Design a protein around this ligand. Sequence first.
Ligand SMILES: [Cl-]
Ligand code: NA
Length: 67
Amino acid sequence: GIDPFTGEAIAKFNFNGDTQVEMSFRKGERITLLRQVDENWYEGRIPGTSRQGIFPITYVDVIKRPL
Ligand SMILES: [Cl-]
Ligand code: NA
């Protein structure tokens, strides 16, 4: 994201969320990383969209971590 504290990732695999709170995406989408919320999940959002939620770290290539 534009906020320099956010991170940046590119989806590495498709991800379908298990429920609403999990954010689905496809490989190749750029994702803003808001927070690494635990040892396995990020909170993030997709630029240009209203898509936002959590997803597992496994499913992205992290380019820049959030601060
Ligand atoms: Cl869930
Ligand atoms: Na899933």
